[PDB]
Amino acid sequence: VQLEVKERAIRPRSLRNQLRHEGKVPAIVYGYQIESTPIYFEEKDLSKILREHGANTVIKMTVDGKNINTLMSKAQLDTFTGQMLHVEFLSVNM
Amino acid sequence: MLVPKRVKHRREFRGKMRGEAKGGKEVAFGEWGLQATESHWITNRQIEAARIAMTRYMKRGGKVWIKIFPHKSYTSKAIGVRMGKGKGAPEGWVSPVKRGKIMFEIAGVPEEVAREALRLASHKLPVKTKIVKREEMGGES
Amino acid sequence: STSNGRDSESKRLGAKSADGQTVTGGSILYRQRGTKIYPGVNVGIGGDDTLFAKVDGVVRFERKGRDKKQVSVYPV
Amino acid sequence: AELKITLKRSVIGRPQNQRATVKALGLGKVNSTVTKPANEAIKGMVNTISHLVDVEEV
RNA sequence: UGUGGUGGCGAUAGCGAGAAGGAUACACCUGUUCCCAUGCCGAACACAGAAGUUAAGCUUCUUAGCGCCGAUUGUAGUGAAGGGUUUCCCUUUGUGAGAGUAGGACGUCGCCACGC
RNA sequence: GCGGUCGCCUCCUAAAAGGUAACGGAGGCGCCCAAAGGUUCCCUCAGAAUGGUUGGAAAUCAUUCGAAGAGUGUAAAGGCA
RNA sequence: AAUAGCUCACUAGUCGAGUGACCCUGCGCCGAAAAUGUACCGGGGCUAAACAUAUUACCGAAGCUGUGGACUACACCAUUA
RNA sequence: AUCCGGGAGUCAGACUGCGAGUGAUAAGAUCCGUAGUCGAAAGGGAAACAGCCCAGACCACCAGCUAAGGUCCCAAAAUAU
């Protein structure tokens, strides 16, 4: 219902290698009303939605306010790791 | 000296390659598969030995998937021949495998026989492996 | 026991003046073999598909929509 | 603005960009000061000689 | 203002699909005597005409099925600094694609004439 | 030493200006055409599907789909509807 | 040669706190055998005098500065130079 | 930096970091691009060591500050927090 929405900057250059060794999610969103921002995630909040509902869920993203229903495109892995990278979101309405 | 699989030529000698890294290239056929998580050449004969170590635990069913194929060719000179003249006659058909890629896949058999056959395979390949399902899809069906 | 080791000389193609220059009459701009860039204003084509500048002026490059490019000289 | 510029490392064994960009500024010996304004040419000098020069402001 | 002629601008201008029209204009159609023509053939090409038809071409309108143009964001790759095995990998600093997308989009501008 | 090679032209190696070696990896040349040249007009290919006597997978035909999958005297690139 | 097998299932038949199964990661172990004498820490030696994360002090060169002498070049200042 | 003249040397190069080739993606191998040092470079460090990390000596002094690398004893500096 209420995941972790923490904003980012335009080009955080190669500090993102340290974001691999600390358990962080560099994540995309682009959708219907509000165009595009990069947002933090931490990996222990999807698994309630994952192992409760499945793969066609409704994530209710926040702007620290009213919710935004998304229609998840890719939440993929990296090789040899099993963690969250290149997580292309997508959001169409009800 | 058993080669299962070859090409049709179009060029004899090829440049010895240079492999660094890969990613993705996941399970798509199946339900149980390896992951070569180093980088090496893998010849013909290793894939024969991997076939047979698969299939002698695949009795009456269960699909075998071979996803890697020897395209390129090595060459070698003789012993007693100096350095010098042109490239020696090609003997062998070897393809590279980087990290990430998947050696073989299985489906149609429960988990225990699957991990048996996959550890029978991975003692015949020079790369450290793992074992990965077709873990999650948008529709697993 | 090798039957190789044969080459041609290098014949040094490529653009021989940039944009924004001041270019005198009849000097080569972009030597080709095969038409890769067509001429525009004040630029002609020799026997081996080279590109002159007929009038003194400034070389500037253009493009014909999607496929191929142009050279043209404007005095200033 | 104004920027103070000093060598605090040798020039030896580093390529022909960095020698010549040093000689363009007026840095002859080690620990020699040069005071120059803040354009965007001189900032471009410092962003390639960052690993040889300590820069302060005036 | 309709129609015809005629130009540039990256197909965002296109392709497929559907509907409507003949005031003028355009087009089909009638014919070959004449300039003219077919390696055979008035199909074209060329020249005479005007019984009719909007069926086709053409013009206007609808449409996101194929094609086109697609931001931001994440990643591979890499200049400059560094560190380990030295086959290869990793860290700071600058720059970032290709795919995959939200989306835009069933044109825009200029001139002359005729009819109204 | 015995073998192979010695001039010229294309491609790759060649690190996206140009240049760059090896007894590195691939092919041609020591000509031809009095029209295969100049100009002025006109024109658009390879295939596939469906029918039609000899007539056959594959001749001459006919309609439709068809941006190139063809041709360019000759090796290879770059071009050309 | 069947066949006894804490009655290889249970009775809380007893006593009265935790006991299994997977992954991911930091540091180790085995795997590890050659020729004059220890014999790849430089030696001594070390349970930190090893490693990992952070913080100040200090040692360290013909590098830099301090006082002085010489030479060359451009200058200043005033004849002289 | 260019132009005009007077006078030479050089045409055997090495290794290291990075792109490639032949080789067995073997060699202090061989052959090319690209940067540094050595050749023509003394001083400090890696025990000793042309090519690796720091740094380019006009000369004197029993003065001072740091680099690379270090601080229990040979051997100068923490038995540091």
UniProtKB/TrEMBL annotation, chain B:
Matches recorded under Gene3D superfamilies: Ribosomal protein L10e/L16 (3.90.1170.10)
Keywords, comma-separated and alphabetical: Ribonucleoprotein, Ribosomal protein, RNA-binding, rRNA-binding, tRNA-binding
Positions in coiled-coil regions: none
Source species: Enterococcus faecalis (Streptococcus faecalis)
Name of the featured protein: Large ribosomal subunit protein uL16
Family annotation (InterPro entries): Ribosomal_uL16 (IPR047873), Ribosomal_uL16_bact-type (IPR000114), Ribosomal_uL16_CS (IPR020798), Ribosomal_uL16_dom (IPR016180), Ribosomal_uL16_sf (IPR036920)
Gene Ontology BP term (one): translation
GO cellular component, one term: cytosolic large ribosomal subunit
Pfam families in the cross-refs: Ribosomal_L16
GO molecular function: rRNA binding; structural constituent of ribosome; tRNA binding
Purpose of the protein: Binds 23S rRNA and is also seen to make contacts with the A and possibly P site tRNAs.
Subunit structure, as described in the record: Part of the 50S ribosomal subunit.
Family: Belongs to the universal ribosomal protein uL16 family.
From TrEMBL, chain C:
Organism: Enterococcus faecalis
Family: Belongs to the bacterial ribosomal protein bL27 family.
One record GO biological process: translation
Keywords of this entry: Ribonucleoprotein, Ribosomal protein
UniProt region (Disordered), positions on chain: 1-21
This protein's name: Large ribosomal subunit protein bL27
GO MF annotations, alphabetized: structural constituent of ribosome
Superkingdom of the organism of origin: Bacteria
Shown segment, full-protein numbering: 18 to 93 of 95
This protein's GO CC annotations: cytosolic large ribosomal subunit
Ribonucleoprotein listed as a keyword: yes
TrEMBL record, chain D:
Sorted UniProt keywords: Ribonucleoprotein, Ribosomal protein
Single Gene Ontology BP annotation: translation
One Pfam family recorded for the sequence: Ribosomal_L30
PROSITE patterns xref list: RIBOSOMAL_L30
InterPro entries linked: Ribo_uL30_ferredoxin-like_sf, Ribosomal_uL30_bac-type, Ribosomal_uL30_CS, Ribosomal_uL30_ferredoxin-like
Stretches assigned to the Large ribosomal subunit protein uL30-like ferredoxin-like fold domain: 3-53
Source superkingdom: Bacteria
Gene Ontology molecular function: any one: structural constituent of ribosome
GO CC terms in record: cytosolic large ribosomal subunit
The protein's assembly and partners: Part of the 50S ribosomal subunit.
Recorded family membership: Belongs to the universal ribosomal protein uL30 family.
Name used for this protein in its record: Large ribosomal subunit protein uL30
Organism: Enterococcus faecalis
Gene: rpmD
